[PDB]
Design a protein around this ligand. Sequence first.
Ligand code: HEM
Ligand SMILES: CC[C@H]1OC(=O)[C@H](C)[C@@H](O)[C@H](C)[C@@H](O)[C@@H](C)C[C@@H](C)C(=O)[C@H](C)[C@@H](O)[C@H]1C
Ligand code: NA
Ligand code: NA
Length: 396
Amino acid sequence: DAVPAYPFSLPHALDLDPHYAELRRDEPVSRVRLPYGEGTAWLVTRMSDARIVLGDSRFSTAAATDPATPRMFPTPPEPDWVLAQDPPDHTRLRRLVGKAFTARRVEEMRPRVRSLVDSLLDDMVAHGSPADLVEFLAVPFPVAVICELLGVPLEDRDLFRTFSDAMLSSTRLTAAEIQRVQQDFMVYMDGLVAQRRDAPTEDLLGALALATDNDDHLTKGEIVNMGVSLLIAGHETSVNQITNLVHLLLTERKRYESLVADPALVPAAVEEMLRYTPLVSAGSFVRVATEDVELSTVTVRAGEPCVVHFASANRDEEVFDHADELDFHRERNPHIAFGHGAHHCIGAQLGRLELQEALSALVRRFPTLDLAEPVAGLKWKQGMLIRGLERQIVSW
Ligand code: HEM
Ligand SMILES: CC[C@H]1OC(=O)[C@H](C)[C@@H](O)[C@H](C)[C@@H](O)[C@@H](C)C[C@@H](C)C(=O)[C@H](C)[C@@H](O)[C@H]1C
Ligand code: NA
Ligand code: NA
């Protein structure tokens, strides 16, 4: 009617729409119309407000399963989705699998992970320059890690990648196309979990099968969907972010040189590019206020929905100096690239390790790495809730 459409525009590369800085300065909480559901939502663009919306029991994701609630994606959320659970029910669900994702358990993975990266970078040198970093690194690396961690067969790669791409549709597919894929993925994962019934496994799917038979307070739907979410997230974030971080490094090649010179700066640079990159192209899973909640400039009423732009909150000038510049030497970096509060990313430590090991490996072994295709011709993924590159031809 009279509030603006969000997203504000079709995205360009990893650029933020200029309107977010305008809102952060002048209207940090504003009404928008999202592409699906009904009514309006408050768009939250500053770090302080984002930590309230993501971090407070007065903001409920369970309330977002109402199909009338505004949302960024065609299908209404279902009660069994991990994102649609509120504590304390959500806390019990994340304990099903949390143990595998602790910083300590992820750190135990670094040797296997580094070996996988090296092997895949040998396949790329064997092929010779120029080569498609998506084909040789960005896809096969995170897919192998999530397959080994869950106990999902590696030969199912093309099957679960086409499911995962459809479920991360923003505008690419219709609600019916995505609903059909959600059904297929649920039945496939329900299938993998069921193979552990008289044959237990030492992997996350084995942990999910024991929960199915022995745990009294988790529904089979919740458990199976958890397996779906881990398999989507565990490859889709890292696959895209390897392309995003390499894009940022090579298009202002000083950045890449800065890490060629001091490879020990890669962990800090991974944190800085996580802050700087809109992996989530726009918006967030929606939170609905269950009670009135005071944000910086407005009181959100019980029943009003809110949506956060993670990448805008990560450019807040009240939080980060020269927020609009990539700086691998900031003393402090309290970004929310992994979210905040209850739904804080379960895989945050695994995403960190994968980006650290892929980047460290390239910066060490490919000091001459360059983009071998025109910037203008880059195939950015269109019509998806996340951003990344379908292809990234590099030369060494
Ligand atoms: C660079 C890598 C990654 C980024 C930037 C990222 C970002 C995020 C963000 C922003 C959220 C919060 C969503 C919200 O609250 O609205 C989140 C949640 C989630 N992430 Fe990650 N993520 C990454 C890697 C991974 C990995 C490797 C996995 C799995 C192995 C994973 C699994 C999840 C899951 C299951 C959730 C939902 C958690 C819940 O609702 O309790 N992510 N991620
Ligand atoms: C509106 C944008 C968000 O998309 C959604 O909510 C999607 C419908 C999620 O259901 C997807 C399919 C799930 O698999 C997540 C577990 C993936 C995990 C990485 C995230 O939480 C991710 C940040 C996500 O919240 C955003 C892409
Ligand atoms: Na929340
Ligand atoms: Na955006």
